[PDB]
Amino acid sequence: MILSDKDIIDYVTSKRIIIKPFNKDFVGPCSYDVTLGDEFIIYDDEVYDLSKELNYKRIKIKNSILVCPLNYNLTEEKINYFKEKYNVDYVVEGGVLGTTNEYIELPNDISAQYQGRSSLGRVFLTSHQTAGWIDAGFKGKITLEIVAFDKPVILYKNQRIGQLIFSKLLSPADV
Amino acid sequence: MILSDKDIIDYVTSKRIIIKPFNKDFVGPCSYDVTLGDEFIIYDDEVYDLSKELNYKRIKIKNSILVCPLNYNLTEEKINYFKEKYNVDYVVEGGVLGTTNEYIELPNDISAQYQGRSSLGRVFLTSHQTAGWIDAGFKGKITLEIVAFDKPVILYKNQRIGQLIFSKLLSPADV
Amino acid sequence: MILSDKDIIDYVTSKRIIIKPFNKDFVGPCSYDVTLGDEFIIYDDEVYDLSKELNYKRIKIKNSILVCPLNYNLTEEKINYFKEKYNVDYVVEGGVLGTTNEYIELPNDISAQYQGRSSLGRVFLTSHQTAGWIDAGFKGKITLEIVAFDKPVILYKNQRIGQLIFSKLLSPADV
């Protein structure tokens, strides 16, 4: 059973679900809208071999970023052309990891599911790869897995990026 | 809690959930199958900059369309080769937006989730990018975000494209 | 309503949900972790035309596979370079279909949803394209639709690949 607006507000009011920072107007009929943090990481090695430690580069945007589909094949010239024309701070290609501004804690009787905003889906921008259920008892900001599938997309620091849907568990979990 | 076949039929019978057109045989154990409309739109600008108005081209298929993965790099020659060999009306590459034939209205105590058909998923054809929850109180046809991830896929006008799963809210939402 | 660890164990203990093979430690707060089978199939025709019978090639890994993003454009030389450097049995590009080791049966009052593991999502490896709800009454192993979206990813025979979330239906379905 999925929490409505009135349930989200109660659970947040009594500290059953923690959302920091919290904003009332981000509560929709049965979800809570989350926003795009300013930090991203880009993988730097040839393959992902999870028996090794991974190497990343980190960026911190001031306003905006251009996210390009895989195999756009960006040269320095192209990146510079995009930076000047669209006034973006960075131009990336392929998978980029980001994060919500919002920190969450879920209690033992709630699971949440992150989904990317539907207006971004309509321009083929995803902020999640998996269906994205999050365990009861989870604590943290949410990691975004950002990929553009059609053409490059500009994203803005602190925009609404997606939303959490909260669902009751049948019974409490052992967290 | 997810509505079963018998619940979907009741909610539709009493006009709690509107599905137009409605077909009984599209009701499965715990979902409702939806069909592919004949209209698609293709984005026409270099980047998606959502502070501007977007330019699209619209197509109306009569039978079928070939959807190609991004960076198939279609020339006129290739498009013509595909049109003749597979008898398709159009050949597209990358993201294409479509719509269900079905118009839906959800009441204040139901959220629905669109998911693409699993036989299409097995050939790497998606009709949705986000997890696709739809708010209680929603009205409209459902927008499909169609992308092929392996090789080109033929789709047919009015085929089953996906399905709606309906879930009860804990409490009514203020719609 | 989503089953917790204690519910998953009960349903499995009384044969309400069948999971073969079953392992207690794969039960998380509100999901059940599933593992990567050793068999994969790769589509062999130019387009997916679902009015025809499909041609596939089958592989059986002994340890590991390298999954490359679409349009990595693998030559024999590149495949050999990867096989030797990363000690993988096979190198594939684009969509590859696999399967869980686990065979499941769901009763008439449960629907399950497969989602890929979140650590794999963070390296842009998906094992499902659709949201992946599975009907009440389903019987079988789960088909994985594996695509890498950023750089090539090594997967291991029998690793945790994803997880099932089980949700109660409002009423029983006619299976």
Swiss-Prot record, chains A, B, C:
pH dependence: Optimum pH is 7.5.
Keyword Nucleotide-binding: yes
Cofactor(s), by name: Mg(2+)
Effect on the protein of changing residue 135 to N: Loss of activity
Name used for this protein in its record: dCTP deaminase, dUMP-forming
Chain sites annotated for binding dCTP: 117-122, 128, 132, 135, 143-145, 163
Any one of the GO BP annotations: dUMP biosynthetic process
Reaction(s) catalysed by this chain's protein: dCTP + 2 H2O = dUMP + NH4(+) + diphosphate
Regulation: Inhibited by dTTP.
Family of the protein in this entry: Belongs to the dCTP deaminase family.
Subunit structure comment from the entry: Homotrimer. Two trimers assemble into a hexamer by stacking on top of each other.
E.C. number: 3.5.4.30
UniProt keyword Cytoplasm, yes or no: no
Pathway: Pyrimidine metabolism; dUMP biosynthesis; dUMP from dCTP: step 1/1
Site (Important for bifunctional activity) residue list: 132-133
One function term, GO molecular function aspect: dCTP deaminase (dUMP-forming) activity
InterPro entries the record matches: dCTP_deaminase, dUTPase-like_sf, dUTPase_trimeric
Source organism: Methanocaldococcus jannaschii (strain ATCC 43067 / DSM 2661 / JAL-1 / JCM 10045 / NBRC 100440) (Methanococcus jannaschii)
